[PDB]
Amino acid sequence: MSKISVTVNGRRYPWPRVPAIAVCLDGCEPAYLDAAIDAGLMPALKRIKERGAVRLAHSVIPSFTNPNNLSIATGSPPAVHGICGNYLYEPSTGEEVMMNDPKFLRAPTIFQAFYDAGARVAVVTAKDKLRALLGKGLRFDEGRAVCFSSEKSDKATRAEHGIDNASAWLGRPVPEVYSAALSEFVFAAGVKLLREFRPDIMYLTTTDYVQHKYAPGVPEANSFYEMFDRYLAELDGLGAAIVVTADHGMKPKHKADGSPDVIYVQDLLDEWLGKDAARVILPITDPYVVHHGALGSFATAYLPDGCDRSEIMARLKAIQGVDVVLGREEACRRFELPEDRIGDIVLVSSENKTLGTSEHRHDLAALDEPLRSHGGLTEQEVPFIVNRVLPELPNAPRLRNFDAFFYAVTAAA
Ligand SMILES: [Zn+2]
C-alpha cells in the first residue's frame, strides 16, 4: 500500500494519523523557556523536552512576525509566498502599499492544501489581520475548517470562519489587544478545538506583547510561559503530535540609560544623496506607526536612479551598529526573499540597536520600559520542540521554523 501525502510548495507532507499541531510562540527567545522551566513553572514542557526532540531552528530574515508566520503556514520562505514585510514602497506612484492582505499571498498554505485533500483544518490567531492572511483558500461549507482570531472572536460567523461567535463558544470574553490574555485565548481555543472539532492540522499563533515588554525570567515573562504550559499539557494529553516553535526571538535594543539605540538611516541618506532622494522603509510594522513599535533591526531602502549603490552600501556598513548591508540581488539570494518586493539595499543592525528613518518629523517614544525588539540575525534562533521521538530531526541552521508542519505531520504519521 502507498503512503498518503499532500504536496505543497514542492514539499511532501505525510498524512497525519493523529492531529498535527504547530504552536507559534511569538517572540519566544529560547531563554524565555529556559528561565520558566528552571523556575519549576513548566512541568509539561520539561517532560516533553526530556522524552521528545529538542532543537533550535532558524527563522526567516527579516525576523518579523508576518513573514515568519506565513513561512510557517506555507512551509516556504518569502521568495515563494511573497510576504516579506508589513509594507513595501513603489518608486512609481510614491505609494506605500500594505502586504498584510491575502491578495498579496503568492503561494498556497499547507492549510488549504490539506483542506482541499479532505482534511479537517483549524487556524487560530491572536490578531485578525493575520487571520485573513493565514486563512486564504479555506472554505466553510462542509464543517471541515475553522479560522478565527482572539481579537475578533465575537465576530466569527459560520460562513466566513466556520464557527458562530468564538467568544461565546469558548465562554471567555474578547481579550484586550495589548495583553497576555489575547494569547491565552488562542491556547484555550486550541484545546477546545482539539477536543470538539478534531482537526487533522491545527495552527495556533500568538502575539509578542509580553516579550517586547519583559525580558526572560522576570515575573511577568515567567507567568506567561507558566500559563502556556497548562494548555500544552492538555494538548499533549489529548494525543496530538505537537511542534512548539517561534516566528522570531527578542533582544534588548537600548542604551545603558534605557533609551532606544537607533540608527537614523533616512537622515544619513538625506545628507549624502539629498533630502528624500532615497526612501527608507521600516517593514517591522505598519508605515503609519511613529511610537517605538516601528523600531526593529532590519530595514530596506529605495535609492535614486543611477546612484553608486556600492559606495552608499560601504558608507552605511562603515557605521558601528550597521552589521549587514546587501544589494537587492544578494539579499534576496541569501535571505530567500522576493526581488520585486524588496528595496535596492537591505540593512541589518547590530544586536542591541535598531534602524529608524529620521530625527526631523521623528519617531516619538511611547512606552516607559526599555526597548526590546527583533528583525535582525540576533533574533533568528528560535526553539523547536517536538513531543515525539525524532532522532533524525535536523538542528539549526538546517532546521527552520517553517519546517514545523513538515515535522509535526511526520511525527503524527
Ligand atoms: Zn512576532
Ligand SMILES: [Zn+2]
Ligand atoms: Zn514585534
